[PDB]
Design a protein around this nucleic acid. Sequence first.
RNA 1: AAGAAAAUGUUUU
RNA 2: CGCGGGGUGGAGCAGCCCGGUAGCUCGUCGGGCUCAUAACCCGAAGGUCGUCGGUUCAAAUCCGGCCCCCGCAACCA
RNA 3: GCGGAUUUAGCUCAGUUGGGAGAGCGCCAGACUGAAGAUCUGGAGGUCCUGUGUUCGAUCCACAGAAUUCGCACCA
RNA 4: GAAGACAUUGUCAGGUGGGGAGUUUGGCUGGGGCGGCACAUCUGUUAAACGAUAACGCAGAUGUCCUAAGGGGGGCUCAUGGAGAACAGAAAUCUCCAGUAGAACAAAAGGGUAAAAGCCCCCUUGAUUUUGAUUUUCAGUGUGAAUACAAACCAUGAAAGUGUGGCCUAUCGAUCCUUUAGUCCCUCGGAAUUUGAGGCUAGAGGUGCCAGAAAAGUUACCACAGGGAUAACUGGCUUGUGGCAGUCAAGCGUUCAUAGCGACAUUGCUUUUUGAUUCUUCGAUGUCGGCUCUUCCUAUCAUACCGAAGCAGAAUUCGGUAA
RNA 5: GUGAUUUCUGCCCAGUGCUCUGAAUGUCAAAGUGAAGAAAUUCAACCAAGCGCGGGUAAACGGCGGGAGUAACUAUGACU
RNA 6: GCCCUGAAAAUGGAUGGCGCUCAAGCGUGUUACCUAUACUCUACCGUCAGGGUUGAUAUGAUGCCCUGACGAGUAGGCAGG
RNA 7: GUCGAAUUUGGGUAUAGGGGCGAAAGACUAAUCGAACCAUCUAGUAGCUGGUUCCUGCCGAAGUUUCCCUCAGGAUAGCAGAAGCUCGUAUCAGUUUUAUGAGGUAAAGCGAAUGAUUAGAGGUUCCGGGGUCGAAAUGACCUUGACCUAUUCUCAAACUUUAAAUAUGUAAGAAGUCCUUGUUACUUAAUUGAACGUGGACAUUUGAAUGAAGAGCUUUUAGUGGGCCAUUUUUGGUAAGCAGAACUGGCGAUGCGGGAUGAACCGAACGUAGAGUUAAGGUGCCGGAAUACACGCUCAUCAGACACCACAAAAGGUGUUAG
RNA 8: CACGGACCAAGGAGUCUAACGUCUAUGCGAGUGUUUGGGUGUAAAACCCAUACGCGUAAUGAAAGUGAACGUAGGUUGGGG
Lengths: 58, 252, 102
Amino acid sequence: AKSKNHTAHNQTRKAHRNGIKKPKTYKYPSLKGVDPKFRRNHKHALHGTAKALAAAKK
Amino acid sequence: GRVIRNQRKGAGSIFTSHTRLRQGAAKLRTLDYAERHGYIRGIVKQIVHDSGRGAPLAKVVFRDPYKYRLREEIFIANEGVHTGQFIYAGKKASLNVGNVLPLGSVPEGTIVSNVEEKPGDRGALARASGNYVIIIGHNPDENKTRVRLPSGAKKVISSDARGVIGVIAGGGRVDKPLLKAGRAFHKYRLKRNSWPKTRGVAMNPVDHPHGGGNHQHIGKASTISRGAVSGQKAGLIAARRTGLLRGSQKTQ
Amino acid sequence: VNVPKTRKTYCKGKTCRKHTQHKVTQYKAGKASLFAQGKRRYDRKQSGFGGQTKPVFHKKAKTTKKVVLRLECVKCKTRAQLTLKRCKHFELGGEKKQKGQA
RNA sequence: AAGAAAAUGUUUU
RNA sequence: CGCGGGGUGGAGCAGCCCGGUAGCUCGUCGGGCUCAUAACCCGAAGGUCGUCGGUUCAAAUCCGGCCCCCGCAACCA
RNA sequence: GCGGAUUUAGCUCAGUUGGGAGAGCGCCAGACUGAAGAUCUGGAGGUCCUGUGUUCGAUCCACAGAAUUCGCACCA
RNA sequence: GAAGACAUUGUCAGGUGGGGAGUUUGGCUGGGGCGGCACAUCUGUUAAACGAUAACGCAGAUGUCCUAAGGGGGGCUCAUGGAGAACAGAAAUCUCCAGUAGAACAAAAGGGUAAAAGCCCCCUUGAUUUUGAUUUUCAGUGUGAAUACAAACCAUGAAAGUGUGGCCUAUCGAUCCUUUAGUCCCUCGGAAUUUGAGGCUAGAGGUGCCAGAAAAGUUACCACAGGGAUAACUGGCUUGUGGCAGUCAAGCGUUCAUAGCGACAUUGCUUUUUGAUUCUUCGAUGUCGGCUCUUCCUAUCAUACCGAAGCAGAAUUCGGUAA
RNA sequence: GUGAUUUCUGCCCAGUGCUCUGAAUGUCAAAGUGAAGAAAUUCAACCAAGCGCGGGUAAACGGCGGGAGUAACUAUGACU
RNA sequence: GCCCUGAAAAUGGAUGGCGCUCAAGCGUGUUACCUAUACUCUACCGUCAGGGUUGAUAUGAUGCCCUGACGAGUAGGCAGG
RNA sequence: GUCGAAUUUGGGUAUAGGGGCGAAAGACUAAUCGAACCAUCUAGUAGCUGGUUCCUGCCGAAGUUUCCCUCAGGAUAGCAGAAGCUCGUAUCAGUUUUAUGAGGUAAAGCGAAUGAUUAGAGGUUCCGGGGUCGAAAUGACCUUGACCUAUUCUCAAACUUUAAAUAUGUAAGAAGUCCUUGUUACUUAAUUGAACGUGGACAUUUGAAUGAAGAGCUUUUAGUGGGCCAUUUUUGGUAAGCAGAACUGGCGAUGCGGGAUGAACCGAACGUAGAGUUAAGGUGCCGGAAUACACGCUCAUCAGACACCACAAAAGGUGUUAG
RNA sequence: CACGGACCAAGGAGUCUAACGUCUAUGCGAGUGUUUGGGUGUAAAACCCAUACGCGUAAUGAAAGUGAACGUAGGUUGGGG
Ligand SMILES: [K+]
Ligand SMILES: [K+]
Ligand SMILES: [K+]
Ligand SMILES: [K+]
Ligand SMILES: [K+]
Ligand SMILES: [K+]
Ligand SMILES: [K+]
Ligand SMILES: [K+]
Ligand SMILES: [K+]
Ligand SMILES: [Mg+2]
Ligand SMILES: [Mg+2]
Ligand SMILES: [Mg+2]
Ligand SMILES: [Mg+2]
Ligand SMILES: [Mg+2]
Ligand SMILES: [Mg+2]
Ligand SMILES: [Mg+2]
Ligand SMILES: [Mg+2]
Ligand SMILES: [Mg+2]
Ligand SMILES: [Mg+2]
Ligand SMILES: [Mg+2]
Ligand SMILES: [Mg+2]
Ligand SMILES: [Mg+2]
Ligand SMILES: [Mg+2]
Ligand SMILES: [Mg+2]
Ligand SMILES: [Mg+2]
Ligand SMILES: [Mg+2]
Ligand SMILES: [Mg+2]
Ligand SMILES: [Mg+2]
Ligand SMILES: [Mg+2]
Ligand SMILES: [Mg+2]
Ligand SMILES: [Mg+2]
Ligand SMILES: [Mg+2]
Ligand SMILES: [Mg+2]
Ligand SMILES: [Mg+2]
Ligand SMILES: [Mg+2]
Ligand SMILES: [Mg+2]
Ligand SMILES: [Mg+2]
Ligand SMILES: [Mg+2]
Ligand SMILES: [Mg+2]
Ligand SMILES: [Mg+2]
Ligand SMILES: [Mg+2]
Ligand SMILES: [Mg+2]
Ligand SMILES: [Mg+2]
Ligand SMILES: [Mg+2]
Ligand SMILES: [Mg+2]
Ligand SMILES: [Mg+2]
Ligand SMILES: [Mg+2]
Ligand SMILES: [Mg+2]
Ligand SMILES: [Mg+2]
Ligand SMILES: [Mg+2]
Ligand SMILES: [Mg+2]
Ligand SMILES: [Mg+2]
Ligand SMILES: [Mg+2]
Ligand SMILES: [Mg+2]
Ligand SMILES: [Mg+2]
Ligand SMILES: [Mg+2]
Ligand SMILES: [Mg+2]
Ligand SMILES: [Mg+2]
Ligand SMILES: [Mg+2]
Ligand SMILES: [Mg+2]
Ligand SMILES: [Mg+2]
Ligand SMILES: [Mg+2]
Ligand SMILES: [Mg+2]
Ligand SMILES: [Mg+2]
Ligand SMILES: [Mg+2]
Ligand SMILES: [Zn+2]
């Protein structure tokens, strides 16, 4: 008793019923894959900027 | 998957011996003082047929040494014993056919029958028609007698074991062809339910080790180990050899 | 494959923590001990009636085993383990290849 | 007292 | 996983068991024997002993492996 | 029915690569013998199963038939 | 009387034990079985120029191999051809010229590569340590493989650099258990020491039915749940095969292609062959053949009437209307 | 097991069984013994039957092929 | 091009039937006409949506009212009855 | 068939369910036998078959992905409902345009590489040598085969320089363009840069078109996980109402008008009605609607008569028509 | 030309429970749960209640163990009101 093996029939219709959703872009994307040396220095630079701007409030 | 016939025989329901017509157990006298020291004379009253036994029996009447009465014994008649013959049983009895003597009191080469395996068992050896035991020697110290049994086996028995001088009557019985299923039927009707015999290869696998197959055949060796279990011991149990026996007996 | 001994490679022995000379041997499993908790449990389970109580693997397919090199640092004796790819013939001794031989 | 092995040889003069 | 039996002229085997060392038969060839043939007798050729190291005075022989074949015991991924 | 194979000096076989046609045994001679038989040497021997087929030609390149057989099927 | 601390009997231990017990005895599949592996995979193609894409599609390949065939550097240039040089010829070694790779790069195939990725030489262990991210398969799980970094320690080179195995695309493995390495760290719970045991981190011993049960048959004595999801009839589609019929006309027929035939080709019809398929039927369409009986078809054997002839007659052959 | 009578039951013990030796022993349980250890324990020797080895056995289960050469037409091989 | 030969199958039978021949056939062109649960307009039912209206005699703000659109349905979900 | 002995038979008695009994059939053991009957465990389990009870309203599928001892089952994602939630000066889109990429199929090509492939010509007679002479060479011819040169005919899913159409990635702004200068342990020879900041300028078209019963977000669950058909692309097969893929549209799940009839074709999708107009299809009669109009063609002793579709070919005909 | 159905009546199939996910309503709220039990009663009801206990208020680690404010409980972008 053999059966059907594969088909993509109706798959695009199913996909488009709830649509192909664009991936909801955000400002400030994540830094997941960024070089860790750059991230370490970025953390130190941002901390320094925060301290400077905290003292800058006069 | 089923209990085979040789297994079913042990329960003894329909395989018991048909003993109704039998004259009673054929036994020597109880070994008493008279036989241990002298002899006692009995008289052969009847020589009768025993159902299921080839050999005739002799009813021998002795006096009771301790009470005024007669005691009838059922010996297995030795050939040549006749009614009205005086039988002498004991250590001092003469070497005449029909007398019951201790094995140690007879010379080498004596032919005896209904020989006790142990003193006082009243007869165990050489009881079938035409059979006998031969005295082949004595060992007086540690008193024993070496004897040859009908099978050809050599046995060492106590010298106080008794036997009847002569050979069991009715010999030659198996020399006549039965010639007929009916004659085998009447033979076994008075012995036991062991006839006729269905071949195991003619049965189904459930009934027998040999059963089954699209041809009748054993399938595996019919020689079966001595250590096999019940339901397996069909065929040739613990066979040292098989095939048409070519050669000599009495292995040294 | 032919793997040499003496293996200059990294050592984590907290004293070397650097590339040192290592002696290379082939790892052998070592005897299965009684009193290992799994063995104790298995013996207890096997005791009595019930027969075999755990699987006995039969459907063997591999024709090789992965060779494990035991790397013992010659200075601090710290041992590391390096697994190689499957090979049918593994040798640690010498007799290196020669180029241009007939 | 006794002393292993030894096969073969075409037809017609 | 473990332990054994082995592997030696073209073929089949001895030699190992504490190393002076490689032989036997069959097969091939040649010779001899016989008046001649067969049988028989002898000689030659044919292997360096599966392989790699070592112990050794020197190893087929011992000691560790490696290859191949056969067998046996044991069995939780 | 269909799928395979073999068709070769007189007999049994090897071929061949788009070439030839050889081996034994048989037969005919020569050595040998008094003459022979064996044993030794030699020699001759096919129009490659048939028709067409491409070629400069062709058993062999390479096709359809005939035979000799091997095997598989022919009612549920 | 015999026998005697032996038998026996009790417990444990090894053997034997289809006599008996319990169980199992893959999947895919143009039915099932046998075969094969399309079951875990890789190259090219099918594949319809993003990606994805099936069949027991096509041509193949994988369970390995390598201390170098890994890493770095340097020098060099390959197949083949031509022209030359004793033995040396068509093929050995030497020389020059041409040489875009027509070679080689472990293996299948595809891609890639020329002061190299190839060949030769020199030095080496980046085939190392730590734990993350990422790509493919994908559920955006695992596994395998791979990418780019970080933090170390190294190799090579003058150096820039390159190297985290093999130029790239395949070459592989959970839980539980065992075992090893590491941490000398945690726990053994009344309190200690020392063994032992148990944990924590990384491997290994393996599941190829490859997301990973521990597993032999037979049943024509058979059983149950089902299945027309699926075979063994008819029927239906098809018509390779079978059968029947055309067209052309090289030749046969003494001469003459077609009286009668007819090669090489080629167009069809039929469903009285056998296949192919699996649509109907497995809560059942009674499975060979014969007998009996009716009817239908015509691709006509005979009978009727005709045409043709290699039809003198006779016999016959080809053909037409005709069931 | 075979299956009246008659006649006859050939060859084969390698295999699977069945059945008996040799154990200057190979495998080898529990108990027991020795060593090491603080012990748990580990290691070792010893080690029954059985297996293994050797023998027997087919009116036990069963089996009873192939190739080569060789007779003076050929063929086939009594023969090797 | 059309027609014809090629053109043989089994119950009696199918351009759907009758029948049709300057067609009621074939090719082509032009109009008129017929009629779907489709389209347009209108009403009514319901659903959904957007609104108005707690200012009184106002007890039904889950009410009353205005406006627009929409309505297929197995397995299945939910709602109001 | 047998009928005087292995004979028939009454009664008593024995053997009881993995048991008996069996002159052996798996026979018989109370119509029960390849394991009796009775009760209980037990409402045993079933991925399998059957059934599953009121109405209306709204929404409304899937037969696909991955994994499974999986292939009649499930988990998983997808499709669906419900509940909503945050907002709505609003966002996006099965679409186009513009700009910019990617591709290696259709086609094309082979006097372009690889591999096939026809022929002749000009040179290597060194050609592979032979035939033939040549006394004998290759010495002169011929030759067939190759090689070289320029041509020539024909081809490729696993060939290719070139190379579409369709399909496909990205962008078309305020999260933008530019300007000044603060942080850092990163980076640079170096305030060199990198990233992130502080400050400042730039709203009618805030930077193509069209649309937008809005956009975004979340939870949770049903069913489904046999599909099939049509056009086109396409694989295996002679083919199939066969078997397997691609895209879309459908049927399943769907009535309605048409194709007589029919799941899928054409048209069109459906609350209850009225009127109008149409679609596809038709208008001799059945049958609503012109035996309408117009130009031709056809006569069939098997005429023909609307796609899917219910078949007909090669070859022929002073039939007839037009070229 | 698949299965069940000759007919009619009556019966006839997603239930209850333990423990749970989402959602919703309600009470109280860093707390919450009176009903094991006690008190009481017009007596299985209703009414009242101490101490505990459960869940929550703390996580993380195999464990020994350690255990949540640099700051207006942070900066930036958006964000209804
Ligand atoms: K049998
Ligand atoms: K147990
Ligand atoms: K003569
Ligand atoms: K057994
Ligand atoms: K079974
Ligand atoms: K046909
Ligand atoms: K059926
Ligand atoms: K034998
Ligand atoms: K034997
Ligand atoms: Mg399916
Ligand atoms: Mg009795
Ligand atoms: Mg008998
Ligand atoms: Mg019998
Ligand atoms: Mg039988
Ligand atoms: Mg049996
Ligand atoms: Mg047996
Ligand atoms: Mg039989
Ligand atoms: Mg215990
Ligand atoms: Mg036990
Ligand atoms: Mg002579
Ligand atoms: Mg001689
Ligand atoms: Mg002569
Ligand atoms: Mg069994
Ligand atoms: Mg199967
Ligand atoms: Mg693609
Ligand atoms: Mg280089
Ligand atoms: Mg893989
Ligand atoms: Mg690096
Ligand atoms: Mg790499
Ligand atoms: Mg592993
Ligand atoms: Mg562990
Ligand atoms: Mg304690
Ligand atoms: Mg799997
Ligand atoms: Mg079917
Ligand atoms: Mg069939
Ligand atoms: Mg045909
Ligand atoms: Mg199908
Ligand atoms: Mg029925
Ligand atoms: Mg019926
Ligand atoms: Mg019928
Ligand atoms: Mg006719
Ligand atoms: Mg007989
Ligand atoms: Mg022991
Ligand atoms: Mg022993
Ligand atoms: Mg016609
Ligand atoms: Mg009409
Ligand atoms: Mg018209
Ligand atoms: Mg409203
Ligand atoms: Mg509706
Ligand atoms: Mg039977
Ligand atoms: Mg139930
Ligand atoms: Mg709807
Ligand atoms: Mg079903
Ligand atoms: Mg392609
Ligand atoms: Mg093309
Ligand atoms: Mg359905
Ligand atoms: Mg429809
Ligand atoms: Mg129709
Ligand atoms: Mg209407
Ligand atoms: Mg009308
Ligand atoms: Mg025509
Ligand atoms: Mg029907
Ligand atoms: Mg049914
Ligand atoms: Mg019925
Ligand atoms: Mg009712
Ligand atoms: Zn170290």
